[PDB]
Amino acid sequence: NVYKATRPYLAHCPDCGEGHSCHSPVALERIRNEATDGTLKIQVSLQIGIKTDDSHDWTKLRYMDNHMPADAERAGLFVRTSAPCTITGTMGHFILARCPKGETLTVGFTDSRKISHSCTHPFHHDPPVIGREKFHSRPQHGKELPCSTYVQSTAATTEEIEVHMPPDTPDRTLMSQQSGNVKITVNGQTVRYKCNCGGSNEGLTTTDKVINNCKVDQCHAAVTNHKKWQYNSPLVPRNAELGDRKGKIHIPFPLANVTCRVPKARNPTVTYGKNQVIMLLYPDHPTLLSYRNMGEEPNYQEEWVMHKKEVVLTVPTEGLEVTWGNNEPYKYWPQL
Amino acid sequence: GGYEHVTVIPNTVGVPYKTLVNRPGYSPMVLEMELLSVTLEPTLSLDYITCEYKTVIPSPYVKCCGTAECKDKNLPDYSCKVFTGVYPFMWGGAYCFCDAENTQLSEAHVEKSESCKTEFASAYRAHTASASAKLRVLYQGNNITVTAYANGDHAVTVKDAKFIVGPMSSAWTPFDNKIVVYKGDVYNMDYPPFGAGRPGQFGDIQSRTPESKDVYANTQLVLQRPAAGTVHVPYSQAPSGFKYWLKERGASLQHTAPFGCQIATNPVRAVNCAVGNMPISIDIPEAAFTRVVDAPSLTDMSCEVPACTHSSDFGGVAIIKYAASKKGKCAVHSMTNAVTIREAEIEVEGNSQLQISFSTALASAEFRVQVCSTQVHCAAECHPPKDHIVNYP
Amino acid sequence: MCLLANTTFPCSQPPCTPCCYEKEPEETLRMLEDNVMRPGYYQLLQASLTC
Numbered sequence A: 001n002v003y004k005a006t007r008p009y010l011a012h013c014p015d016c017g018e019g020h021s022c023h024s025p026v027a028l029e030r031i032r033n034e035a036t037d038g039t040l041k042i043q044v045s046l047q048i049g050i051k052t053d054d055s056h057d058w059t060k061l062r063y064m065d066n067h068m069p070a071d072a073e074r075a076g077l078f079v080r081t082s083a084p085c086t087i088t089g090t091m092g093h094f095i096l097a098r099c100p101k102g103e104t105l106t107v108g109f110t111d112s113r114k115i116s117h118s119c120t121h122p123f124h125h126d127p128p129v130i131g132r133e134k135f136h137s138r139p140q141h142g143k144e145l146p147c148s149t150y151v152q153s154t155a156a157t158t159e160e161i162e163v164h165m166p167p168d169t170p171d172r173t174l175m176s177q178q179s180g181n182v183k184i185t186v187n188g189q190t191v192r193y194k195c196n197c198g199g200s201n202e203g204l205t206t207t208d209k210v211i212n213n214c215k216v217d218q219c220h221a222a223v224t225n226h227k228k229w230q231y232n233s234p235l236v237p238r239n240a241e242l243g244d245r246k247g248k249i250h251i252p253f254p255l256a257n258v259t260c261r262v263p264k265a266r267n268p269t270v271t272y273g274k275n276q277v278i279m280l281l282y283p284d285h286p287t288l289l290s291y292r293n294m295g296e297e298p299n300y301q302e303e304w305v306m307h308k309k310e311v312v313l314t315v316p317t318e319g320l321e322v323t324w325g326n327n328e329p330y331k332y333w334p335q336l
Numbered sequence B: 001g002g003y004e005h006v007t008v009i010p011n012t013v014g015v016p017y018k019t020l021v022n023r024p025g026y027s028p029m030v031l032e033m034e035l036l037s038v039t040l041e042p043t044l045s046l047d048y049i050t051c052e053y054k055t056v057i058p059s060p061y062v063k064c065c066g067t068a069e070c071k072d073k074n075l076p077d078y079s080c081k082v083f084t085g086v087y088p089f090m091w092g093g094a095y096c097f098c099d100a101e102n103t104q105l106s107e108a109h110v111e112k113s114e115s116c117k118t119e120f121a122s123a124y125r126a127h128t129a130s131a132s133a134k135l136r137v138l139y140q141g142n143n144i145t146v147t148a149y150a151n152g153d154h155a156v157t158v159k160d161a162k163f164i165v166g167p168m169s170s171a172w173t174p175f176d177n178k179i180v181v182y183k184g185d186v187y188n189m190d191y192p193p194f195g196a197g198r199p200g201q202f203g204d205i206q207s208r209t210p211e212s213k214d215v216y217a218n219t220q221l222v223l224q225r226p227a228a229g230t231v232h233v234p235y236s237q238a239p240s241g242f243k244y245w246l247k248e249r250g251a252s253l254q255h256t257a258p259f260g261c262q263i264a265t266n267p268v269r270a271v272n273c274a275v276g277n278m279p280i281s282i283d284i285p286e287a288a289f290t291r292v293v294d295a296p297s298l299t300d301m302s303c304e305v306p307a308c309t310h311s312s313d314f315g316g317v318a319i320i321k322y323a324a325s326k327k328g329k330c331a332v333h334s335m336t337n338a339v340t341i342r343e344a345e346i347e348v349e350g351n352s353q354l355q356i357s358f359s360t361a362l363a364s365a366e367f368r369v370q371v372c373s374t375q376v377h378c379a380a381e382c383h384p385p386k387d388h389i390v391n392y393p
Numbered sequence C: 001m002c003l004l005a006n007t008t009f010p011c012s013q014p015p016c017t018p019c020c021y022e023k024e025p026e027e028t029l030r031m032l033e034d035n036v037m038r039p040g041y042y043q044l045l046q047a048s049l050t051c
């Protein structure tokens, strides 16, 4: 288990809801759109499929609640652009989702208390067309074409991310006004403090300390996290004590070259004439229509056919090649 | 110990061509030849590969009550900046004690993405192309396949017959001096050279191989000042040139190339390019030839055409009556170039008749048929076909 | 071969075993941070994070 060392964290999010910035427990790190099929590899601050006790459980996800990690339901997790996305794979900091045409991306969840936490980032999502036909549903039988996707396999063996020790977590609840002096309650934690008064103003303490002749607003206290690991996030500050001390962990769902099945458009009704070919097209979805001459001057012409259209094409002595969507190219030659 | 027959056929795939072999003193022989595939493989030289770039940004070094210092690192597109008078905030309040004397160090570099192993475009330099052909020959009543280089030097012996294909009449290639390959698509592109890539365009990130250690980068990476009370590394950068090329590339050589060229990859090649002609030399052995005396003599020949349609295919039927000296095999060939006969060899015996299929474009076709060593005149009145356009060459 | 302060040890067999993170959580992460550039890093990460 790799999740015993790593922990979920709180990071910056530009839109937590209504266009307001917050320290989100579901903050977006990196969105990968390298897959040609349309599958997105989303990176978040929380961990999915792991409980607070580090044990694996697909029905649960762990998020950072104020200062301590807490458990949340998997069913509450949602991904959306302009309309809700179809979830395909979830393990650790990573999410696999098939999204429709959108301008932004939102990743949300529901915690222990029924309160919705979401993070919105401006991401232009418009996956390219595989083949020559703009279809909606995936077919069981069709033309086999090369495409790339992030494999739904939970095992991590190829790709990796950088991990380091978390920075000093600031906490104002550590300091209290004891009559007219500052009282720092350690509570079994290594606390790093600094005061705007004389004497023992700063240092790294493991026990309770009392700052004489000082006010609560004049002091700053922080909890040190040296026992756990955290992703090298640009949304989280670097640890002040350690230099370039880093570690690395293998990440699930790597990119691999696969095969995408595409449907072939129905053959149009064809009629012939003197060095001319007439095709009565009937598309069910947007279909690419391309043609070229089989001689010295090819003169390539292409058009995306949307609905019922009649096409008049010229057939020279050298020949004419016509390609209707994902179908094999039709070849035409004149008689005599 | 044989006879060398030299003939020239047009460089067109899927058309059966007939050739008459006439060795002096020996009975004629008819051979049917069909080009199955003509492959033009260019000699490649990889310059570089391009893929999606990865902007590696570590956690920003926030120095409370002090100044941070940027060090020059030997990294591609390495950017470093120290911002003064910062006051960032975390979940439980401010991160720094001071208010005006805090600094933030922002650093970022550009390298190859994880996808570069799978998703990449290769920039090749095409040299002298190699020609090769797959030919089907109907020799002695059996179909034989000959695969040889179309250079007029590579000899392939199939059933004791030596075959020499080429040299090609046209040295034409659909590929230019500089080509770009993506999966199964080839593009004729004048790509930028190594170390001369521009931001937001093809070649913004350059590397020798998809697994290479060093990488060239020019993406115009500029680091920006972070937002008030926010820990983040904002930056201005030109988007992926490879990602922009994937939607702006247009049609590949498979759809744009002249002469009806079919483009394939692994290795890159031009398949079935209908350009020029192809010379074929066949060294037929002694055993295959039969003497005119040992061959049946054909006398009292007459021809009748009961059905004909002038089309690209064999739309004509001809019945030839004959009187033979003995039983044996005779070669059938058309002496008129406007008419072509489907049959190459038929069995001849006594006072009998033969049926032949023929193709012509003429309305009134007057052609001579040579059965063995004797000729017969055929009178054909062929009618127009059903369709003006056909789906076969 | 993995490193630890001044001694060389085989990556798959660390001295902290059994349960490296459970005994000392800070000492285990510091050990992995020094072996990040080593070729047998993932052999050490698999051994140190198994109980």
Ligand SMILES: *[C@@H]1O[C@H](CO)[C@@H](O[C@H]2O[C@H](CO)[C@@H](O)[C@H](O)[C@H]2NC(C)=O)[C@H](O)[C@H]1NC(C)=O
Pocket: B016, B138, B141, B142, B143
């Ligand atoms: C030699 O090969 C040719 C071409 O493949 C064969 O010719 C025909 O084969 C089938 C017969 O019904 C048809 O499906 C084809 O359309 C036809 N092709 C042509 C060009 O005529 C031929 O039979 C073979 N002969 C031997 C002896 O192997």
Ligand SMILES: *[C@@H]1O[C@H](CO)[C@@H](O)[C@H](O)[C@H]1NC(C)=O
Pocket: A255, A256, A257, B117, B118, B119, B183
């Ligand atoms: C397919 O992916 C594998 C693994 O990433 C790589 O080794 C291979 O070169 C890729 N091939 C193509 C044609 O993209």
